[PDB]
From a paper:
Although thousands of proteins are subject to this modification, only a single essential glycosyltransferase catalyses its installation, the O-GlcNAc transferase, OGT. The modification of hydroxyl groups of serine and threonine residues of proteins with O-linked β-N-acetylglucosamine (O-GlcNAc) is implicated in transcription, translation, signalling, proteasomal degradation and cell homeostasis. OGT is composed of an N-terminal region comprising 13.5 tetratricopeptide repeat (TPR) units and a C-terminal multi-domain catalytic region. The catalytic region alone can glycosylate short peptide targets, however, the TPRs are necessary for modification of full-length proteins, promoting peptide cleavage, and engaging in protein-protein interactions.
Since the current full-length model of OGT is a composite of two independently-solved structures, in this work we determine the structure by cryo-EM of full-length unliganded OGT to assess how the catalytic section is oriented with respect to the full 13.5 unit TPR region. Through iterative cycles of particle classification in Relion we were able to resolve substantial heterogeneity in the particles and determine a 5.3 Å cryo-EM map. Into this map we could readily dock two copies of the X-ray structures of the catalytic region and most of the TPR 11.5 section. We find that OGT, in agreement with the 11.5 TPR-only crystal structure, forms a dimer supported by a relatively small interface (~560 Å2), which buries <1% of the total surface area of the full-length protein. Early maps generated during data processing provided density into which only the catalytic domain appended to TPR units 6-13.5 could be modelled, TPR units N-terminal of the dimer interface (TPRs 1–5) exhibited high heterogeneity, suggestive of flexibility in the TPR units of this region. Interestingly, we captured only one dominant conformation for this TPR region into which we could further model TPRs 3-5 for one chain of the dimer. Notably, by cryo-EM we do not observe this 40° kink but find that, in the absence of crystal contacts, OGT does deviate from the previously observed 2-fold symmetry with each chain being related to one another by a 173° rotation. We note from our cryo-EM structure that TPR 10 is shifted 5 Å further away from the catalytic domain compared to the OGT/UDP X-ray structure (E334 Cα to H529 Cα comparison). The positioning of TPR 10 in the cryo-EM model widens the gap between the TPR region and the catalytic region compared to the previously proposed full-length model and leads to a propagation of increasing discrepancy in the positions of the TPR units as they extend away from the catalytic domain toward TPR 1 and the N-terminus. In the unliganded structure, the immediate advantage of having a larger gap between TPR units and the catalytic domain would be for protein substrates to have increased access to both the TPR groove and catalytic cleft.
Numbering used by the authors:
A (entry chain A): 79 to 624, 629 to 709, 721 to 746, 761 to 1021, 1025 to 1028
B (entry chain B): 181 to 625, 629 to 710, 719 to 745, 761 to 1028
Write the structure that this text describes.
């Protein structure tokens, strides 16, 4: 009863709790209406902590007497402890309806909703409380907490200050207000409030963590590190401190220790998706790609909100060539938010690799406007523009590019430009060599992972059976012009004193040239399945050796391993590679005199006559003679067809210009050309046009096969005026500069009937070219753009014009030899760098002293003369046609002999322990 | 989905901001393409000052509707909320293109300019908005604000009037209205519109602050205090409310309270030179010499800056003589205050009055009128009350001009009868009427820079010659004032540089008090030491003759009474604090009881008829020590002066100093500083307030009076010289730094004037040490206080009238005012 319940109270006060609870139960059984009995009931339940016992006891109490107000408050406390929120809210509603004012119960409901997740109602009820409870420490504290959750810090400062009025010093409230200040950006206010918290009590380690976060906001490395360490000493239970300490340590450069911190933090809890990102990033930095991808996928699967995970996984897929997956990741990242410009920059790189230049240009513009200093994005945008040759804001862009070049050169960062792109920006020779050296030692940084001991370079040929073991190493043995330039030399390489080793490093294509050169080699090697440069280097060292350079996908770090005693760059890159392991480089005096060695990082091997090589004497010998270049015809049986003709017009020159009268054969040919027919047969000779030779024989069109049929070609097939002196040049838009185009405009204005022949390289840039020509005052008739044709037909249609063109920006090597074998002459102006001196040296080997201009004006004047002086033009054309065969320019066998002589010089130099001059 | 949006819109209409944002966040989750919902959510977020969320909602809304006018307008409103210039201006351009017919867009754009500086385009957009409509009276408001910035004052007045006439719903408009009313000088309507605005919105505290400023112009001190209270309770952080509250407390003499509130302002703003200088003045009053040099030098910098910044000088010219600044600085501040007069007189639009150059209009005489509010209970009237009666009616006509209501004091009505004419100007609210009356009086030739002096009247120039004499011991800086009276020594040519008026040199001095009239009973006294016990009375000689024997100690002598039954009975009465007794039929009293026995005679209105005795021991004054004395106002004392006094004390074996509590709040710090300067508490004596007669009388017991080098004791010097008492003084820098030496020269005792502070201490100790020297000096000063005409107020009037003769001979000959030499 009442007295027995109070005796139970005495029992609890004296310490005998169980007797207390038994007497409470007894008194309740006597009269359940006991308010004191219910109080002792609740006290016993709380001491026991029985959730269901307390729940049912309070249900019985409330149904017995619902007036109990604070009892409903403790009921809500219990329901919150359970976690079931609807019961708590219903109880709060019942209490408020029964008695309107419960600011404490309203605070309880506010915390309930804070658990529920609706900030706004929470702050609303907080204000309700602070109104009806002007002094309520919990109300203001939780209000500040909810505002901190909602990022609305300003009201939180006032709420926490009023709580401070209620509690003049409390560490938790100080830390919360410090977080409010940090989210305010109030660095000093935040650090002060955090130090107020720690002086309130140094127990909280997360206090140290947050203080060191403020320190990092101020950038104090060591002090923040000390705070993090001390917090770990107090508690390593939470891994946020470990995570940020790992972050800063990672920034320090002591890598693997911070890596271990990352991994153990993630061990503490997988929820640190950011730590997962850091781990995958360092995995990529070390080359652990697949696991990094797995971690990024994990982070996305747990946290689809973030997108820079997509960015970095796209970076991984770039490292692993997964273009499709990378683009998917970029799409997801941009879909989350496009404000992350560098993601669009990587997507632009992807499109550039894909040829979607305009999208990349637009994305790069968006990035650069987003962040003014994105030197890599700026450089890549410039590269895309030079791809499309849009000279809008041309020279100012070049100037800012030079500025970015110097800026990145100073701060020891990777030059955003590429060595192939170097000629697009005529910077200093020092800039050239610095970029090349940095990119060459990019191989060194990768090769350092295995720390392979240096190979014992053989010194004598006795190990190699008295023969020179030469290893030709390239992944480009296939659909590539360089192969289409030197593939015959392996066969023509002399096996008498030299052994041939050829190393394929890319998936095979099945082309005739591939297996052809494979058979040419004394030893073909298929390295295209060795992911480790070390294994390939070991294989080479086994081969005891005594082509790609800065090319897409190339992995020349094996050269940095120097498995051969002599390593020299040649035909791989148009210039020096900045490679300390490239002992020599093969060039000529005409293009590389000893005086320009200031920009050269390798020793110079001098070719007595020429360095470049091509074998259209074998690649396309059928075009050695043809049947002045308006409508031209060629075929395997040219002389046989001519002798099968009724009448042939003979033009004297041991040479002649074969001329056919406009007879029935000629008229039928013209009709077939005009009707776009497949081909016809005349006199038993297959007469074909070039517009569908692939449908006739694509392999023959590739030059793998010499076209056995007979091809007649007319400029009218392109709709050209068949009575005009036509200029031509077909290289990609990169070789084009505004100044040379204006000089060409001057040439075309000087020459009465002057038009220019162009190839769509690429296509979509035509409007810019037309606008530039109009601003240079030349009509559309002066320029014609055409789709691309295979190499054989490329050279075939090249000789249609009387003269080609030269851009001293980048010299002519591919098309230079194409036209050297086309018999159509061309003039050029030498440059400073090798890439601007290729065609020049080609013509020096040709020996035409008058095909070099020492100034742009000289170039223009000679161009006008030759396009106008048709008698001098004909003499030059005949001299070119004679000398392209008479000269050893295509004597690839004797070229091979002289290369062997140069190899003899190299091995005499090395074997004696020691630049090669002839 | 949309239904929850509608319910949230309803709840926002009910005014639940947070329920509104909750429901609208729910709606935007329900419909990501709910443009109008994003609009409403951003709007309510802005209502609740929630910037970033409104930013996001509005960015989405623009993605859903690329162009809506009010959308972009409120976007720019939030842009103002966080304050970004380019965002604001570009949003304004997009708004004006979106809807040209929307004035408030132009208004906020003008606000952007206002924070930027393109005030031109600001007013331009104002005009454009007016062209669209004058309904948006907000435009009227802020355009009148920028006009007030410019100075098209009356035009701005028109703007504010018409804007309020559009609608009174904009309290700030009423506020600026009352502000300009105060600026021009009309008060009652300003207060009424203050109350109008406060009725509309009682929230604005500085509204109450300016109400209080207007009331202080009305001089309703209680109104000032109540407005201060309401303002500071609405906001204590408003440093200006505290500053002006402390100013009013300084007016009420609450110097510590003013110091506290002024330090409150200084913490609310580190450098508020106005409250800074007023706090400094309060410190000077209390002489809290802590933070001495930093405060005073920052004041020097402040006054130089405001000389450059052409602002209101914070240091009042009364305090000019206090701060050690330049002659140019002080006369420049004086000229600034002269402008503060002339600008106000400009609205009176009165062309200059006629200025006679003859005597016939004044029936062969010269009309000189005297204007002041100090007619009555004021030291000036206590200095020169009888001289108006001593003016010659044969050559001059006397005119009085009361600037204060009559107090009924004897001096007041006495001088009113002395003057040939009295005028009660204190009844005239308009300066124009007073100047017209003066011109009616035909005046050709007294407070100066002081409290309540309507100096604008002198600015009005109703008299051809306007001069200031002994009214305020500093220059005016106002060229409309012509002359100032001085002597050969105090204000020589080398100091003439700091006067905007012409100088007037008296024969030997220009100072005079009514001691010879108000206190002649001390002409001779009654009491081996010299001034241990003092007794005087009208029947003093009769009592002495009624005595058994009276000793005579030297035509001049010192009456002495032996220690007989009567003398010892007087001693006992003193030790008992008896009100009064009567011996031999002669009533015997003390000054301490003269408050009730005869307050009128104690005030100098009457000569004390009774015989009154007093001695040192009445207040703990040792009877065998060298007692130096000085009793001026506390602010006239500085640490350097106290240290000079410390040197003088340490150069005398047993010397004590008598002082006053003026008031007493600062005395503890004073004595603490004295202890810091090695001065024992026994060596200093303090006394409470004493009325004129007794405070003058008590000096005779003391030995030597003192003069502060910075400022002389104007009243005090006359008080001590009428007692035949030596005093130490030195020629200083300011005019008020040479008055005491001027009186010493007038007495001719030049050896009592020291040339330096070292010589100051030398002469002080020399006097306080040698018995023959001190006694003979005291006696000779006693002799010469009557032998010299120093108190001949009639001869003072004679020389004043001779100077009048010379001045009128110069002026009536067409000459502009010129320095009077001899």
């Amino acid at each position: 009863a009442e007295a027995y319940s109070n005796l139970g109270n005495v029992y609890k006060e004296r310490g005998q709790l169980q007797e207390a609870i038994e007497h409470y139960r007894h008194a309740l059984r006597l009269k359940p209406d006991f308010i004191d009995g219910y109080i002792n009931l609740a006290a016993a339940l709380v001491a026991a902590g029985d959730m269901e016992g307390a729940v049912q006891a309070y249900v019985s109490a409330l149904q017995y007497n619902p007036d109990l107000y604070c009892v409903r408050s403790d009921l809500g406390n219990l329901l919150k402890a359970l976690g079931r929120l609807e019961e708590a809210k219903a109880c709060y509603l019942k209490a408020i309806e029964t008695q309107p004012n419960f600011a404490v119960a309203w605070s309880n409901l506010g915390c309930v909703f804070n658990a529920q997740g609706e900030i706004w109602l929470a702050i609303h009820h907080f204000e309700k409380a602070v109104t009806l409870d002007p002094n309520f420490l919990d109300a203001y504290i939780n209000l500040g907490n909810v505002l901190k959750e909602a990022r609305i810090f300003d009201r939180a400062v006032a709420a926490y200050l009023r709580a401070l009025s209620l509690s003049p010093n409390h560490a938790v409230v100080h830390g919360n207000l410090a977080c409010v200040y940090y989210e305010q950006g109030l660095i000093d206010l935040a650090i002060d409030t955090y130090r107020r918290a720690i002086e309130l009590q140094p127990h909280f380690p997360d206090a140290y963590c947050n203080l060191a976060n403020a320190l990092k906001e101020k950038g104090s490395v060591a002090e923040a590190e000390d705070c993090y360490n001390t917090a770990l000493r107090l508690c390593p239970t939470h891994a946020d401190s470990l995570n940020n300490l790992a972050n800063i340590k990672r920034e320090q450069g002591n890598i693997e220790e911070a890596v271990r911190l990352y991994r153990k933090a993630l061990e503490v809890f997988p929820e640190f998706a950011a730590a997962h990102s850091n781990l995958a990033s360092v995995l990529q930095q070390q080359g652990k790609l697949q696991e990094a991808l797995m971690h990024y996928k994990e982070a996305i699967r747990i946290s689809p909100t973030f997108a820079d995970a997509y960015s970095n996984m796209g970076n991984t897929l770039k490292e692993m060539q997964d273009v499709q997956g990378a683009l998917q990741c970029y799409t997801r990242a941009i879909q989350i938010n496009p404000a992350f410009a560098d993601a669009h920059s990587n997507l632009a790189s992807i499109h550039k690799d894909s040829g979607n230049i305009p999208e990349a240009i637009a994305s790069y513009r968006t990035a650069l406007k987003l962040k003014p200093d994105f030197p890599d994005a700026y450089c890549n945008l410039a590269h895309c523009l030079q791809i499309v040759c849009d000279w809008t804001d041309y020279d100012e862009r070049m100037k800012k590019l030079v500025s970015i070049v110097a800026d990145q050169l100073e701060k020891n960062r990777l030059p955003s430009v590429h060595p192939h792109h170097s000629m697009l920006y005529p910077l200093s020779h020092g800039f050239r060599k610095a970029i090349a050296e940095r990119h060459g030692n990019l191989c060194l940084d990768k090769i350092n992972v295995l720390h392979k001991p240096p190979y014992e370079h053989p010194k004598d040929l006795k190990l190699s059976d008295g023969r020179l073991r030469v290893g030709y190493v390239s992944s480009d043995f296939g659909n590539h012009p360089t192969s289409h330039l030197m593939q015959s030399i392996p066969g023509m390489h002399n096996p008498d004193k030299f052994e041939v080793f050829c190393y394929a490093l890319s998936p095979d294509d099945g082309t005739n040239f591939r297996v052809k050169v494979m058979a040419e080699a004394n030893h073909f090697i298929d390295l295209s399945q060795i992911p480790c440069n070390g294994k390939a280097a070991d294989r080479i060292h086994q081969d005891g050796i005594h082509m790609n350079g800065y090319t897409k996908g190339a992995r020349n770090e094996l050269f940095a391993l120097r498995p051969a005693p002599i390593q020299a760059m040649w035909l791989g890159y148009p210039g020096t590679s900045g490679a300390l392991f490239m002992d020599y480089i093969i060039t000529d005096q005409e293009t590389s005199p000893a005086e320009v060695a200031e920009q050269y990082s390798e020793k110079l091997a001098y070719m007595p006559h020429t360095f470049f090589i091509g074998d259209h004497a074998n690649m396309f010998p059928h075009l050695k003679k043809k049947a002045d270049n308006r409508i031209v015809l060629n075929g395997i049986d040219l002389k046989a067809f001519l002798d099968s003709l009724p009448d042939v017009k003979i033009v004297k020159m041991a040479l002649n210009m074969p001329v056919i009268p406009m007879n029935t054969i000629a008229e039928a040919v013209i009709e077939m050309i005009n009707r776009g027919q497949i081909q016809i047969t005349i006199n038993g000779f297959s007469i074909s046009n070039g517009l569908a030779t692939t449908q006739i024989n694509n392999k023959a069109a590739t030059g793998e096969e010499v076209p056995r049929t007979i091809i007649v070609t007319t400029r009218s097939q392109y709709g050209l005026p068949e009575d005009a002196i036509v200029y031509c040049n077909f290289n990609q838009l990169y070789k084009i500069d505004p100044s040379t185009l204006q000089m060409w405009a001057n040439i075309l204005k000087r020459v009465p009937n002057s038009v220019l022949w162009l190839l769509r390289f690429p296509a979509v840039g035509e409007p810019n070219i037309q606008q530039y020509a109009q601003n240079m005052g030349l009509p559309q008739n002066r320029i014609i753009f055409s789709p691309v044709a295979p190499k054989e037909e490329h050279v075939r249609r090249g000789q249609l014009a009387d003269v080609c063109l030269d851009t001293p920006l980048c010299n002519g090597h591919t098309t230079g030899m194409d036209v050297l074998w086309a018999g159509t002459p061309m003039v050029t102006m030498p440059g400073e760098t090798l890439a601007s001196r290729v065609a020049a040296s080609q013509l020096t080997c040709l020996g035409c002293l008058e095909l070099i201009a020492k100034n742009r004006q000289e170039y223009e004047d000679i161009a006008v003369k030759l396009g106008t002086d048709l008698e001098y033009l004909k003499k030059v054309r005949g001299k070119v046609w004679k000398q392209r065969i008479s000269s050893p320019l295509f004597n690839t066998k004797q070229y091979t002999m002289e290369l062997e002589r140069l190899y003899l010089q190299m091995w005499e130099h090395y074997a004696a322990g020691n630049h090669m001059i002839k």
